[PDB]
Amino acid sequence: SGAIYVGNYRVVNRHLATHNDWANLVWEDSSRDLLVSSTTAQGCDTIARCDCQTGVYYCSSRRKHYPVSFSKPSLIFVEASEYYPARYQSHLMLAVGHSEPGDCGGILRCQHGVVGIVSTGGNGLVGFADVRDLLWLDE
Ligand SMILES: NC(=O)[C@H]1CCCN(C(=O)Cc2ccnc(N)c2)C1
Ligand SMILES: [Zn+2]
């Protein structure tokens, strides 16, 4: 689990969104595994606006942050689960590293701020849903 709180927005993995998230839905994209809901309290997380390919992510299944190199956001094949059939998830970034299903929502960060959140994993590759292109999150 995990979310990004910026302004009056809460950004979570779509497969983990709550009833409250859906009742206060702002935007959702199944092809990106992202959902944004509105909040009453103001959030102060900083979204990175960059092309960084290095960062650090939080891995809850190890209580540790790991430094990784990751690919630029792109369309990648994702095997089916109880949340989705087999499909191509877009705006996804891969890195060599450990993850478990419960790690989804762990933040990936660079020197400029929040890059994205853990969304996919398996066979030693961890995938992050990018949020750096969502300029409206800051307005
Ligand atoms: N974005 C999706 O379609 C995900 C929905 C939930 C299932 N899924 C995963 O990759 C599960 C996962 C995540 C992280 N580490 C792992 N070792 C296994 C795909
Ligand atoms: Zn950066």
The total of structural domains in the chain comes to 2
Q: Check if 84 has its Cβ closer than 6 Å to any atom of ligand 1.
A: yes
Is residue 86 domain-shared with residue 100, that is, in the same domain? Answer: yes
Q: Check if 83 has its Cβ closer than 6 Å to any atom of ligand 1.
A: yes
Contact 128, 95 (CB under 8 A): yes
Is residue 79 domain-shared with residue 131, that is, in the same domain? Answer: yes
In angstroms, the CA 86 to CA 133 distance is 25
Report the relative pairing of strands 34-44 and 125-130 from DSSP bridges: unpaired
Mapped onto helix, strand or coil, the DSSP state of residue 131 is coil
Binding residues: 50, 52, 110, 112
In angstroms, the CA 54 to CA 57 distance is 10
Q: Which atom of ligand 1 is nearest to the CA of 120?
A: 10
In angstroms, the CA 57 to CA 34 distance is 18
Closest Cα to residue 49, out of 127, 128, 110, 119? 110
Q: In the chain, where does DSSP find H-type helix? A: 19-23
Domain span at residue 22 reads 3-44
Report the relative pairing of strands 25-29 and 54-59 from DSSP bridges: unpaired
Q: Check if 33 has its Cβ closer than 6 Å to any atom of ligand 1.
A: yes
